[PDB]
Amino acid sequence: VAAFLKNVWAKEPVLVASFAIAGLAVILPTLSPYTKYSLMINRATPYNYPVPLRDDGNMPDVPSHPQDPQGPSLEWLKRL
Amino acid sequence: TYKYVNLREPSMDMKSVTDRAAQTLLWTELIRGLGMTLSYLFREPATINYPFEKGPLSP
Numbered sequence: 001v002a003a004f005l006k007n008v009w010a011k012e013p014v015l016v017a018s019f020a021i022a023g024l025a026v027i028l029p030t031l032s033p034y035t036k037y038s039l040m041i042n043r044a045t046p047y048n049y050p051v052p053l054r055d056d057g058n059m060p061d062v063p064s065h066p067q068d069p070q071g072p073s074l075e076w077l078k079r080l
Numbered sequence: 081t082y083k084y085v086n087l088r089e090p091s092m093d094m095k096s097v098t099d100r101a102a103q104t105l106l107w108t109e110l111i112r113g114l115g116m117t118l119s120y121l122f123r124e125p126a127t128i129n130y131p132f133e134k135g136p137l138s139p
């Protein structure tokens with residue numbers, strides 16, 4: 001069938017450059033592990049205002065002073 | 081006698097047909113001349129500057 005794929009590329013080498021890019025953009029988002037970083041960054045941007053919850057007993061974490069040890073690590077990006 | 085023009089056949093082998101598919105789709109021709117043979121403007125113009133200068137004749 002490869003003789004076909006070289007005998008449409010002697011006549012219409014145009015749309016073939018579209019298909020060649022048509023796929024290869026569909027396939028790859030399920031591959032490279034850089035993705036799913038993309039979903040973590042985009043969730044953490046505080047559009048809104050954080051509202052402090054009520055602490056009686058627990059209070060699992062997150063003390064009054066924010067810079068004290070509180071919660072997750074978002075600074076894996078700052079070094080990135 | 082004779083001659084025959086525009087009588088030729090494409091070669092039809094994958095060493096060639098890239099060379100004709102590196103042409104349609106990458107524009108490797110059509111920039112050959114008018115990317116170039118046009119410029120090629122760097123030659124001195126040819127003008128007889130008229131009210132003063134004038135051109136040749138014969139007796």
Ligand SMILES: CCCCCCCCCCCCCCCCCC(=O)OC[C@H](COP(=O)(O)OCCN)OC(=O)CCCCCCCCCCCCCCCCC
Binds near residue numbers: 011
């Ligand atoms: C994995 C990543 C992806 C990998 C992809 C690999 C590369 C794919 C990308 C290629 C796509 C490039 C652009 C698309 C192709 C060019 C457009 C095209 O297909 O032209 C086809 C045209 C059809 O001609 P034809 O089929 O031969 O029919 C006539 C027969 N008498 O045949 C022609 O030649 C038409 C030529 C153009 C027509 C107008 C030209 C007029 C002059 C303008 C040229 C100036 C443009 C230069 C660009 C300037 C940029 C600053």
